[PDB]
Structure formats: C-alpha cells, structure tokens
Design a protein around this nucleic acid. Structure first.
Lengths: 75, 71, 93, 82, 69, 85, 75
RNA sequence: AUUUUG
C-alpha cells in the first residue's frame, strides 16, 4: 500500500490530521499537492490541550507540521 | 493543483490566517507566492481573542502560516 | 548577493552581533561569506559577567543562521549607496 | 578529513548520538548517508532527564534531529592511519 | 573560512547552551565540526567543572559560535 | 534509503515524530520518501507538563505517517524498557 | 501582483516589522532581499516580556529574515 | 520541504 495513494483514495471523504503540536483537524478532504499541503472542507479544528474546537468552511493547511493523516476522520 | 485552486478562489475575499504561534489575521487576500508569503489588505490581528492591531497592508512571511481559511 | 556585499564594505569596522540566544558581541568585522557567517576580532561581550566562558576568547566565528541582528553606527554614504544597490538589483534581477 | 568521512569510517563501531531534545542513543553504527541519517544496531536509548532507559535491537535516526555524535578517539587514529 | 582554526584549541557553544573545548580537526560546508580531545565544561556562575568526552562530530545547525583559545 | 523498510513489512514498529509524539503500528506500506502506512496504530500519550509518557494510549487504526516529521523508527520486537545499565 | 511588492514599494519608508521572540521594529527601510533580510535606519525596537516593554534604539540595523513574521508599510 | 532563511 502506497501512503499517498491511500490519501488520494480518501478524496471526498473525511480525513483526520494530527499535527506535531497539540492540534488536530478533521474534515472532508478536497485535495492535496506535492508537499501534502491539504485542502479540507467542513472542518473542525481541535486544540487538544484546551479542548476548544472551531469550525471552518474550507481551508488550506500547511503540510509542514503534519505527523499523521487518518482516513475516515475522527471518532 | 487543489491548494492553488482554493487560493485562487479566495483571492480578493476575506480570509482567516492562523500562524503556528496561534496569532490570527483577518484580511483581504491580495496575493501569495510559492513560499506561501502573503499580502493582506485591511488586516486585523488577534492575539488569543483580542484585536491587537490593524494594518492597511501587511506582508506575512510564509514559514509562519499554519493555515488559510475561507470566511 | 546584496547583504554579502554590504557586509564586505563593513570589514575592519566595528559592529555588534546580537545572537538569537540573546548574547551580544561587539567587535571588529574581519570576514563574511555567502551564508553571512562572520568572523569578529578583538571582541567584547555585552554583560560579560553573564558569559564567563567568553573571557579568554579574542577572535570568533559565528554561524549566519544564529544571528538575529547586526547593528553599527550610521554613515550617510553607506545608507544611500545601499539603497541604490537594492534598487539596482530590483531593476536587474 | 571531513566530519562525514569520519562518520562513514565509523561504520561497524560504537557511537553515541545525542538528539536535539537531549535523548541519547548508544550503539554500533550500521549505516549513514549524506543527510547524516543513521542506522544503529544494539542500541541503548536514554531519555532526556536521564530517568527512563530502553533497549532497541536496531533503529533509524533522521539526520536533522541530531545534536552531536561522539566516537572513540581510537577510531580517529586508526582512520588517519588508513 | 574555518581553515584558520584547524588544529587549534577552540571553544564551541551549542544552541542548547553546552560549552565544548577541544582541538578543531575538520569542518565542512554546513559548519559540521569534528573535534578531538574534547572536554565539556559545565558552568555555574563563574565556577566550572570539566568532563572528558573524546571526539565529537557536531552537526553545524547546532553551533552558535566557535572561539579560538 | 539506508533503511530497508521491507524488512519490517507486517511487523510492529515504533515511530517518533519531531516534537515528541510516539506511536506504534504494523507496517503495511511505505514510499521512497519514508511516508508510511501503519495499521492497528496506538499512540502513547504524554503529560502536558513534563512531556513524559503517561502510560495512557489511544487507538488510531490505519494511519499515514509523514516521512518529513519522522525522527525515529525502530522495530518493537526485541525492545524493552530496562534499568540503568 | 506578488507579496514582496508590498516590501518593494516600502523602500525608503518607515516600516513596521513583527519578529519572533516577541520583538517589534519601527524603522526606515533601506534595503531587503528575498529572505526578508533587511537594513533599517534610525530603528526603534520594542521587546515585550511577561506586560513589560524594553525600548532600544539603533542607528543602523541588519535584521536576518528568518526571524520576520510580518511587515507593514506606512499608513 | 533533511543543517545557513522553518
């Protein structure tokens, strides 16, 4: 299984992104580029130290800090 | 390119920029480049929850940008 | 290499390098390369008692990447020629 | 003799790696590259505070996480001689 | 370049605050350093103690400064 | 790559990321950039204060690991916390 | 048309600069490059500490671009 | 997008 093919197979579906810091995003994967900068839509952003969440309709996430990409979104 | 299409569809509109520090900038996205450097018109800066500054035009160095979000 | 050339023109003059680790070193600029690594001579450390390990150092090398500021005394010829050079690069490159 | 040439010449011999966060890895240098990526065998991992310890049969270390490397002086001598 | 410091005794200050004192044997274009007969000098105010350490390969990005002694 | 990841195919490995995150998972795939696909992944959670592990884990399932933020890779088999040698 | 134009059009102007480490600069921009290294003349620096502010002055100040967060042209 | 422009 190739990592980026799994990500590409997730387009249109939910994707859970876990940053190196205590921050996470979960939303519909619109797309991504050669550095895995990611466009998500209908997104919830999580601060996992404070527990505060925010919503975003559509966003481009800088891939620099991304540790993990989990297809199927977040429980 | 999905990131480039998103950016081209929010240029000239009002966007939320979050920096890795968590400082926030709301403004009109003028243009961007390959390093994700940004030019913003009519910029409000927010630290925690409070507006701390306004700028008629602001250059943001792209290494600081955590995300660009449609408003 | 605009600032490489600027620093070339500051060679043998006094500057103060403020490192990102908050130490400040005054001294005579003897060298600078493409990465803005610098060599200082006859150095003096600001708040020297705070940095005892520097007391027996006379010359030193500083990696460009750890520099926050380099500051020095003003000269009008310096300022206007530097602005001229920046405009020249912008017309050219 | 360049630092990375010494590093390549340390293959097969003990090494200490300290990471940027203060973790230390003791073990035999298996392989290395120009990024300073390393592979080690028979490894003892010490955590920053010096509190907890681990044994790892092998491990890979990405080069841009390294603070420094320590090697035996004898290695530098025997590499100079050859 | 650093060629002027080769085979001389130097103090190297690292980003984490460590002071290494040893003989500079080599360097490269990242300012990776190779030091021989190195001690690590641990300071508390003006007082210090030394620890023998042997040979270091210091990754250049961690080097704050190199001072000739 | 100096690491032949195919040697860990279908074995559990431990990965550490820049910043301190630690996971384990069963290697299902990889590319030449050291992105990974791991299955049955568990993350070892840390204390917000000391940054040290708590012993608590969370399950994460099938995960794509970014090679750019990988700092450590090691097989789990043969690993053990040990007392100070 | 490109973001660095904001900096270009700010030459010989008093610019405001926000820097990592809770630092701020105000000064006349004399030169810059694509890293956002710059030289500022007659520059004031505000260092914020945790609340309290230290003010410093420099006749001529080179700033390394990697500390730069934000540049704002004058009003 | 693996050390001097994160």
């Amino acid at each position: 299984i190739l990592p980026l093919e799994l990500i590409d197979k997730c387009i249109g579906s939910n994707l859970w992104v876990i940053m190196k810091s205590e921050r996470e995003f979960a939303g519909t994967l619109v797309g991504f580029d050669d550095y895995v900068n990611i466009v998500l839509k209908d997104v919830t952003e999580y601060d996992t130290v404070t527990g505060v969440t925010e919503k975003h309709s559509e966003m481009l996430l800088n891939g620099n800090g991304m540790c993990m990409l989990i297809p199927g979104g977040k429980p | 390119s999905s990131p480039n299409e998103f950016l081209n569809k929010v240029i000239g509109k009002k966007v939320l920029i979050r920096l890795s520090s968590g400082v926030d900038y709301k403004g009109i996205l003028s243009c961007l480049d390959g390093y994700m450097n940004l030019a913003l018109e009519r910029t409000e800066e927010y630290v925690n929850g409070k507006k701390t500054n306004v700028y008629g035009d602001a250059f943001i160095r792209g290494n600081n940008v955590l995300y660009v979000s449609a408003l | 290499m605009l600032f490489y050339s600027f620093f070339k023109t500051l060679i043998d003059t006094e500057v103060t390098v403020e490192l990102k680790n908050d130490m400040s070193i005054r001294g005579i600029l003897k060298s600078v390369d493409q990465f803005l690594n610098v060599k200082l001579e006859n150095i003096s450390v600001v708040d020297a008692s705070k940095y005892p390990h520097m007391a027996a150092v006379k010359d030193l090398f500083i990696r460009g990447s750890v520099v926050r500021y380099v500051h020095m005394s003003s000269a009008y010829v310096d300022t206007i020629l530097l602005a001229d050079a920046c405009r020249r690069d912008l017309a050219n490159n | 003799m360049l630092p990375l040439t010494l590093l390549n010449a340390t293959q097969g011999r003990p090494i200490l790696v300290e990471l940027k966060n203060g973790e230390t890895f003791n073990g035999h240098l298996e392989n290395c590259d120009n990024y300073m990526n390393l592979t080690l065998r028979e490894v003892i991992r010490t955590m920053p505070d010096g509190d907890k310890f681990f044994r790892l049969p092998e491990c890979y270390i990405r080069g841009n996480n390294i603070k420094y490397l320590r090697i035996q002086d004898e290695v530098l001598s025997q590499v100079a001689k050859q | 370049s650093l060629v002027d410091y080769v085979d001389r005794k130097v103090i190297v200050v690292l980003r984490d605050g460590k002071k290494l004192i040893g003989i500079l044997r080599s360097f490269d274009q990242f300012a990776n350093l190779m030091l021989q007969y190195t001690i690590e000098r641990i300071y508390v105010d003006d007082m210090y103690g030394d620890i023998d350490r042997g040979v270091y390969i210091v990754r250049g990005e961690n080097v704050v400064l190199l001072g000739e002694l | 790559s100096i690491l032949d990841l195919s040697r860990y195919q279908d074995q559990r490995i431990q990965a550490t990321f820049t910043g301190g995150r630690q996971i384990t998972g069963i290697l299902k795939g990889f590319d030449q950039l050291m992105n990974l696909v791991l299955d049955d992944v568990e993350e070892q959670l840390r204390n917000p204060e000391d940054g040290k592990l708590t012993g608590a884990i969370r399950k994460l399932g099938l995960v794509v690991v970014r090679g750019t933020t990988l700092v450590l890779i090691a097989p789990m088999d043969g690993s053990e916390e040990i007392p100070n040698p | 048309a490109e973001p660095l134009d904001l900096v270009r059009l700010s030459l010989d102007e008093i610019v405001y600069v926000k820097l990592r480490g809770d630092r701020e600069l105000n000064g006349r921009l004399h030169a810059y490059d694509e890293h956002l290294n710059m030289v500022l003349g007659d520059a004031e620096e505000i260092v914020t500490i945790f609340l309290k502010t230290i003010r410093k002055h420099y006749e001529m100040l080179f700033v390394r671009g990697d500390s730069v967060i934000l540049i704002a042209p004058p009003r």
